[PDB]
Structure 1
Amino acid sequence: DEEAEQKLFSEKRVELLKELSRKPDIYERLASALAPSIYEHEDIKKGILLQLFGGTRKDFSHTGRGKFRAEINILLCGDPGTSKSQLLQYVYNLVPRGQYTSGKGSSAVGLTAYVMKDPETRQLVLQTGALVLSDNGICCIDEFDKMNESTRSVLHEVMEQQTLSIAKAGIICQLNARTSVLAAANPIESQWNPKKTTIENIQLPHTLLSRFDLIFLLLDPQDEAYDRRLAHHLVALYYQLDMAVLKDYIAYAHSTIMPRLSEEASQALIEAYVDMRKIGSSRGMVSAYPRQLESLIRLAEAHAKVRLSNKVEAIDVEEAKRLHREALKQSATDPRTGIVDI
């Protein structure tokens, strides 16, 4: 409601925001402004920034196609203690219209909708669940893996078609569920073991993994230098970019910027999809489907929107590719087996 309000920014504010957008590293600054208390998960924070910006809403209505999902769905898969729940908590406490779900505490009808009897009118009324209450926001699903397939099938239609068709006893409709999904999950065996391939170790239905457009592998390097740096950050946390500018920057980008693909961006996307499909066709890697091309499109549009660009260019597609590869650690992945360490 605020972002749609025409006089939300003074001219001074708009000029300051545009001056920020001209900075070479506005992307990194805005990403680093997120979850400032979390130590160097720069790629996860960039992905979450892109999720907060989101892709370009499109009207495919005259194409027979249906509704295209402009939302970015991120999955954080990693061994415990790596601060996934802290990131989900930060996004939960930062966005309007968000929901937090964890594990077995949610059901399928508790995420979609159900009938209760309003105890002020003595009338049965329909109540929405977590996935509809975040219809234009982010639903944070924690312990994604410790969550039974009954309720995780509900996510398929939400993540593909942004709608929630319910055909119950009397009530038939299509609730809107245009949510972004930020999911955090543990590997099978709750700890990444290096003897198993990525697919064997994430252990999610392979159709469901294609719905996420970033899978960040939050793996622990047995690295002593990182141990020391993280230890200093955490201990320093026991004794001692603005937000308002970030807030207004994102609001301005949502209001005014509608990135459109340029011809050379189009070509970059074609090449990127073909290459990524060659790469992911290996043994136990997360494969690429035509849905990952749209993942790239969404990420590129979001990145162009970070620049206040209004035009998607090769740099946006390049950053989409890079983010997609860094998540999943595809540089550390051989085309035969799992990964090792960075």
Structure 2
Amino acid sequence: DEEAEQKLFSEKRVELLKELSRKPDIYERLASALAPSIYEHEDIKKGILLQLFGGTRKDFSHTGRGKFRAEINILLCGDPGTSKSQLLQYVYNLVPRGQYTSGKGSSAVGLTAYVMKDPETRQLVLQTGALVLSDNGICCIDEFDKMNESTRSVLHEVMEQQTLSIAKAGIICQLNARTSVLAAANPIESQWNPKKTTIENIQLPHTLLSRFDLIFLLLDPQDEAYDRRLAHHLVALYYQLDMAVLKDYIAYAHSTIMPRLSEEASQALIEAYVDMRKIGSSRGMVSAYPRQLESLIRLAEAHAKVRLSNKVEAIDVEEAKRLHREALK
């Protein structure tokens, strides 16, 4: 509601934002200020920071293609105790217009749209679920594994086309939303056994793993150094950057930025997809379909918005390619 209110920024503040956006690492300096209670986990905060900006909002009404999703869906898989649900509980309390759901306490129609016998007029009327009430924000879905395959095949529409087509007793309509899932699951057997293949610990289909574009595998064992550093950090919470910089940097970077691709960036995006195929084909980890080539765009542009660059260049593809590669390892 405060896009007209962005023009209501002190010009003393736009200087601050534009100058903070010039330091060589403003990316790692803002990211590392998310949730100052999680331990390092350096990449997951990068992904969850790029998710708060999202790719450009291009206008494809002319090409008859339809619309184009601009928000980023993130999946977190990894063995227990690795602080997944804490990240969801932190984001849900950060973003406005969000929801938090669970595995068994949510049904197929409760997430998208149900039809209720209105009490007074005795007529069937439509209502909105959880994935539509968010609509501008994040829909944290914890316990992603423990949802029977019925209620899981519902996300296929709302998370890829940003739409929802309902055809029931008297209601024939077509909603739409601008949500962005952030899901968390456990491997099958709840224990990451390295005997099996990556496409077997997750046990999700391919028509659902491809709608995500950042599958973070929190592969964390009993590293005697990591455990010691984490415990040393956690105990400290018992003795005893700002927000309004981030809380305003985000509003600005939403209001007055629209990164358009280049020709030098576009020429690193073609090979970055022709190699992904040969890589993901053999290993049996997670194949790559052309949809990923759009995700890179989604990621690349979303990186440019961090530094207010208004134009996508080469490095904004190498970064959001290293991010896409070094998450599954």
Shorter-chain TM range is over 0.9
Residue-by-residue CA offset, 1:249-272 (whole Å, 9 max, x unaligned)? 111111111111111110111111
Q: Residues 6 and 251 of structure 2 are in contact (CA less than 8 Å); yes or no, is this contact kept in structure 1? A: no
Relative distance call for 1:176 and 1:4 in structure 2 (3 A) is: farther
SS at match of 1:231: helix
Residues 144-187 of structure 1, C-alpha deviation per residue, up to 9 Å, x if partnerless? 11111111111111121000111111111111122111000001
SS at match of 1:151: helix
CA distance in 1, matches of 2:120, 2:240: 50
CA distance in 2, matches of 1:322, 1:283: 18
* Alignment check: 8 A CA contact 1:99 1:134 kept: yes
- Distance apart, 1:122 and its partner CA: 6.7
SS at match of 1:183: strand
Compared CA separation, residues 108 and 239, structure 1 to 2 (3 A): same
Q: 1:80 to 1:13 in 2, by over 3 A?
A: same
Which residue pairs with 1:340 in the alignment?
Answer: none
State the alpha-carbon separation in 1 of the partners of residues 120 and 319 from structure 2: 54
In 2, the alpha carbon distance for the partners of 1:6 and 1:54 equals 18
Larger CA deviation: 92-101 vs 234-243: 234-243
- What is the root-mean-square deviation of aligned Cα atoms in Å? 1.4
CA distance in 1, matches of 2:8, 2:197: 50
Change (3 A) 1:65 1:227: same
In structure 2, distance between residues paired with 1:243 and 1:278: 43
Please state how far the C-alpha of 1:65 moved relative to its aligned partner. 1.2
Structure 1 residues 8, 80: CA separation in 2 closer, same or farther (over 3 Å shift)? Answer: farther
TM-score, scaled to structure 1: 0.93
Q: Distance in 1 between matches of 2:307 and 2:277?
A: 28
What is the CA–CA distance in structure 2 between the aligned matches of 1:146 and 1:49, rounded to whole Å? Answer: 27
Write the distance in 2 (CA, Å) between the matches of 1:93 and 1:194.
35
Partners of 1:4 and 1:255 within 8 A in 2:
no
Asked if the contact 2:124/2:170 (under 8 Å) is kept, the reply is no
Count of residue pairs the alignment pairs up: 329
String of CA shifts for 1:284-325, please: whole Å, max 9, x gaps.
211111011111110001000011111011111111101101
In structure 2, how many angstroms separate the alpha carbons of the residues matched to 1:242 and 1:120? 51
1:174 aligned counterpart, secondary structure: strand
TM-score (norm 2): 0.97
Q: Please tell me whether the aligned partners of residues 117 and 124 of structure 1 are also in contact (alpha carbons under 8 angstroms).
A: yes
The runs of at least 4 consecutive aligned structure 1 residues that moved more than 2 Å come to 3-8, 115-126
Distance in 1, matches of 2:259 and 2:265, equals 11
Shift of 1:41: 1.1
In structure 2, how many angstroms separate the alpha carbons of the residues matched to 1:314 and 1:272? 12
- Kept after mapping to 2: 8 A contact 1:3/1:252: no
SS for the counterpart of 2:39 is coil
2:13 is matched with which residue? 13
Distance 2:203 2:134 in 1: 27
Please give the alpha-carbon distance, in whole angstroms, between the structure 1 residues aligned to 2:91 and 2:301: 21
Q: Does 1:237 align with 2:237?
A: yes
The alpha-carbon deviation at position 234 of structure 1 amounts to 1.2
Report deviation, 1:120.
Answer: 7.3
Question: Which string of whole-angstrom CA distances, capped at 9 and with x for unpartnered residues, describes residues 51-78 of structure 1?
Answer: 0111111111111212111010000000
**1:5, distance to aligned residue in structure 2 (A):** 3.1
Q: What is the Cα deviation at residue 238 of structure 1?
A: 2.2
Q: Deviations over 1:117-163 (max 9, x none)?
A: 55677765422100001112111110111111111111111121000
Residue-by-residue CA offset, 1:194-222 (whole Å, 9 max, x unaligned): 11111011110111000111000011133
The 8 Å contact of residues 200 and 284 in structure 1, kept in 2 or not, is answered as no
Q: For the Cα contact (< 8 Å) 2:6–2:252, is it kept in 1? A: no
Structure 2: runs of 5+ lacking an equivalent: none
Query: Matched residue of 1:120: which SS?
Result: coil
- Is contact 1:135-1:178 (8 Å) kept? yes
Q: CA deviation at 1:45?
A: 0.3
Equivalent position of 1:31 in the other structure: 31
Percent identity, aligned pairs only, is 100
